[PDB]
């Protein structure tokens, strides 16, 4: 169920792309590992390094509670 597949063309720099990006954050809000996002080394850097921005502007969470 690797996330990269379940999406088409996307830009790893558009930090306002909240709807797309919000998949790359686990159920608990944490940035997902390369073993789940399917991104290569080089790409996961741009992925994270933008996700952080999107949090700052208020569009992504820093953390979430965990419901069972």
């Amino acid at each position: 169920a690797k996330v990269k597949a379940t999406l088409g063309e996307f830009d790893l720099r558009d930090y306002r792309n909240v709807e797309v990006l919000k998949r790359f954050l686990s159920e608990t809000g944490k940035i997902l590992p390369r073993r789940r996002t399917g991104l290569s080394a080089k790409e996961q850097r741009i992925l994270a390094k933008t996700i952080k921005r999107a949090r700052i502007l208020g569009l992504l969470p820093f953390t979430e509670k965990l419901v069972r």
Binding site: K4, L7, G8, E9, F10, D11, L12, R13, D14, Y15, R16, V18, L39, E43, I46, R53, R55, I56, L57, G58, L59, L60, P61, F62
Partner: protein
């Protein structure tokens, strides 16, 4: 001159009039600093991932610009001066990096 993307969030709970005023302060400020507006996109409110100034929602702005390198810092300071502006974040505009 270089290309940047001014992002700004405002007090969501204003009237439409005062809202324009802050933009009037903003727009006059951009001009005072030699900013040149290119694209510009105004999405307004958006449900926030977390409260900013204890407020679940917030009004957005955004303008791609062209202005001098040395002046962006001094501008953001001036951009942040109003008690209603709540976040400013100028990012160097860079070409899209694509997957798939």
């Amino acid at each position: 001159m270089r290309r940047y993307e001014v992002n700004i969030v405002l007090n969501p709970n204003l009237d439409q009039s005062q809202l324009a005023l802050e933009k009037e302060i903003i727009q006059r400020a951009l001009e005072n600093y030699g900013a040149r507006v290119e694209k510009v996109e105004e999405l307004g409110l958006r449900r926030l991932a977390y409260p900013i100034a204890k407020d679940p929602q917030g009004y957005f702005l955004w303008y791609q610009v062209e202005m001098p390198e040395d002046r962006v810092n001094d501008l953001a300071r001036e951009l942040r001066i109003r008690d209603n502006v709540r976040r400013v974040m100028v990012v160097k505009s860079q070409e899209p990096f694509l997957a798939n």
